[PDB]
């Protein structure tokens, strides 16, 4: 009766109970999926958070910037799901851009070392995760990444927008590779969601004007979205990621599904 | 258990067993949906074809160019599904373009009366179907239309491509209206499907319709079987479900990913 | 010294001194072009307007819905420019949508007979003009149409947006045809300009809420446009149309140049 | 009389007589522009090549990865054009992607250190050039970068396509900055050009680079000559002129119209 009954899915990106990945994982488990979770740096925090999910799931360490973590990932994942078992789904819910590349800091003042760390984690890592997990993925499988529509320039998002543009391009290429395994690669372009970092930004953490600009963006989103947009609810986004992990979008790859209330299709 | 369990869906566009709508209806019924089918002109042919679907479904007449058929549609639909029952889903799988606007006929030789009939049936009727069925649709509902990616010009499709461009624009506006009812409006841009309209209605056209399938399969990272409408039908059901709840005025590409690749 | 020195250009769409076509024609003449002007219905009004252009230009009647006017157009144009002379440029600055298809009238209440008149004049006519004038056009030539970005739904524009979406598609096809003559076909997607009809709309002619919605759109345009947007100045749009009529965009066809202050590239 | 009469334009990216920048510079000078040229690494080779341009132009060193070169650029440029003079135009014709990220090497085998060098030179440097030259640019000015349409994935281009996608995003942001100075920022998405970087830097690669030209010419309604950079160079000059005054954060396609057609 579950949308993902008997599916083995890797879910990365859980840091808090407000992370999009926390809701992707919760909905996937509600839908019968058996999960493997990857965490970065704060493994003690991630453990106490992931324990509050509907079901038990092994937690593995994964710094996408660590080439040893990536090289050992498939072996570690196979150990957690059992020899002879493969993944049906992979969720990349990873994004990061240093403070110099987002907020009130002038767009021209982001040092390249920072932008490069940001593009490494936010875009390149999508291809790294794919390279590492495709050898242990089943035909009919699904790789899903989290995107924020970068088609147009926005205030404050700055170099994260640039990283999303790179991620969109990476995805179309990952799909060419994924296809050889009978696996789909897609992105979910979500509307803005109130994660801990996002509430902090809106509160003025990256400067006041950045907070005010994002608040206008969030307000405008809901105004344009024909069915509305509730940034305080990550479940519609999580439900969309599950739809892509399911067998119900079998002919969609190298693509982007917009879980944004339809705001991107409206000007005013 | 099914993806569309206890959902009341209207499905238009069944003419043959090869119609995309025939497969949309078959998959929806396999998925627990209770259907209402609309048909055009050849109602005797349609009833016979639809009797081959997995389950019984009332068949209603609908010429989208007939303003009386549209004006009475909701009342007729309510009669078929029972008073106090509303639709959860609407499938617009309607397209037509006279021969002068699609094929070997030069793009410049399509008379406007023909292009106009084509845009009426292929684009404007998407808004007509919504106007007529939104009053009898439930919050959480879904309106789904069939599209063929018109972003770039292509040989033979000519004015049907122009009509698809109009349909995509109509859809974004239908979504503004649909939203007031808590209903989503979206299109499925399918890869080419060897429906009879495709082969039969649309010289060495045999190798032409074979080559189209082959070229598309190459571009598609996951491939493309022009003889198989089921992946398209599954994508339509995904939009009719509760699993794409924040997607409206949009296009989902059920094309194997061909549109995302240059070669 | 003129961008269009010794070029023979047909310019359609002059109705008032505020028409985009009036400024396209004025800039083209300032740039050395020899013009042929087409007018619709109000030929007495068009004559007294076009007389206030920098130079004399023959005025011909053209109702794009009249198949006789179209069938005789090339012959009439050849008569005005002289036997043995051909056009180097064609400007389609024609658009119309009945009141039922624009404004506060509900989108669902536009009768098809009206939408059809609108798509006939606004989209189909681009291909009609091309069909009629390509036989009398020189290699290196340029067909230019006026567009308003229809990528996203907007309030009030309603069925005119639908017609622009059709026009964009028509253009890509016209370019396939035009190419056989060595002629380019493109559109200029202009930001909103304060023509007589537009000021009337903003004033509340198609209902108050439509006027208010358009005023917000115009305000937002200038806000998003990185170089600003002055709807009261049609010269930047006219200069863009001339750029496409010139030999300086020789490898651009079936395309759209955005003379919108760059507003379409910015979200907020 | 010329399209760029009395305009002071910086032109970067000349390495050979086949470089797009060599033709951009030649056409700009033919059009009355007074140029400042920037070169990377092989300055002896570049000075010799640029001595073949229609007119004398000072050549300055610029490694876009060198923060000292960038920090001193405006001061060095002002010295070459005279105190009290500012730039009206800037041409960024810079691109690089190590072999691991472009060609037969599998997409998954490009080390990040290489992709990062590529994105630094190909995308980030567009913003670096603007940061450095906007303080010495005149209102009405123009910043123009070279792009290759990255909307869809394509064989061999791999991570350079990823870098072009980043460059298009960078451009929209550079335009927000540029706008404060009354300066436009735009990209020219060119069709393929048989520059040496193209043929030489990017087995049966001879028939590969011939077939690319032929396929593109078919798709292009007006055709495409891969051996002719002049139409691209003319499009760059159009953006550097005063004839596209309301276009910024945008892309002009100098590809013969190939991107607007599916076949
Ligand atoms: N929040 C929004 O408004 C929004 C909208 C659209 C898309 N997104 C995207 O959704 C994704 C998830 O982020 P979120 O908004 O849920 O916030 P989040 O902070 O909850 O999650 C981001 C995750 O990235 C992980 N991460 C950072 N560096 C890493 C590394 N080196 N290796 C592995 N993991 C690393 C973090 O540990 C964290 O769990 C990101 O791709 C983000 O860009 C967010
Ligand atoms: N076959 C493909 O390659 C393909 C690809 C993408 C999209 N599509 C679209 O899918 C839809 C169905 O196409 P198909 O291939 O199944 O062909 P089809 O001919 O079987 O279906 C089109 C339907 O439209 C109906 N119709 C025509 N005029 C009508 C009118 N005036 N009133 C009411 N109904 C009318 C026909 O009776 C028919 O049932 C169309 O919208 C088509 O444009 C087809
Ligand atoms: N004003 C804006 O905000 C704006 C923005 C972008 C694009 N446009 C487009 O620019 C074009 C020019 O319109 P405008 O805004 O300058 O207003 P306008 O009223 O000055 O011009 C429209 C022209 O269409 C002509 N026309 C109408 N029906 C015709 C027919 N049957 N045959 C021939 N000509 C016919 C009119 O006579 C008139 O000269 C249109 O395509 C319009 O949609 C306008
Ligand atoms: N040739 C094509 O098919 C094509 C098509 C579209 C766009 N382009 C783009 O046009 C531009 C020029 O390409 P081209 O084909 O003329 O090749 P090219 O190799 O001749 O030019 C690229 C230039 O970048 C310079 N460069 C590289 N690394 C640098 C650095 N660290 N600092 C400063 N300068 C550096 C090189 O010296 C060279 O002058 C590039 O941006 C390229 O991506 C090329
Ligand atoms: C200094 C802040 N750094 C961040 N890096 N990634 C982030 C996650 N994210 N991604 C989008 C898109 C929106 C948000 C908030 S915030
Ligand atoms: C004479 C042409 N008549 C048709 N009208 N609609 C059709 C359905 N259709 N639409 C697309 C797009 C592809 C196919 C097969 S064929
Ligand atoms: C009842 C009003 N009818 C109109 N038909 N064409 C118009 C011209 N136009 N085109 C765009 C785009 C914006 C405007 C004002 S107004
Ligand atoms: C080893 C690869 N190095 C290169 N870096 N930039 C290049 C220029 N370029 N960019 C595109 C796009 C097409 C061409 C020829 S070749």
Residue numbers in the entry:
A (entry chain B), C (entry chain B): 2 to 269
B (entry chain A), D (entry chain A): 2 to 203, 209 to 269
Paper text:
Isoniazid (INH), a successful frontline TB drug for more than 50 years, targets the NADH‐dependent 2‐trans enoyl–acyl carrier protein (ACP) reductase InhA. InhA inhibitors are known to modulate the tertiary structure of the InhA protein binding pocket, in particular the substrate binding loop (SBL).
Crystals suitable for structure determination were obtained for fragments 4, 9, 12, 22, 24 and 34 bound to InhA. However, the pyrazole rings occupy the same sub‐pocket, stack against the nicotinamide ring of NADH, and the 2‐N‐pyrazole provides an H‐bond interaction with the 20‐OH group of NADH. The 3N of the thiadiazole ring and NH side group of 34 and 45 H‐bonds with Met98 backbone. Similarly, as a result of the deconstructed fragment 34 retaining the binding pose of 45 (pIC50=8.1)14c as well as occupying the same pyrazole binding pocket as fragment 9, compound 47 was synthesized.
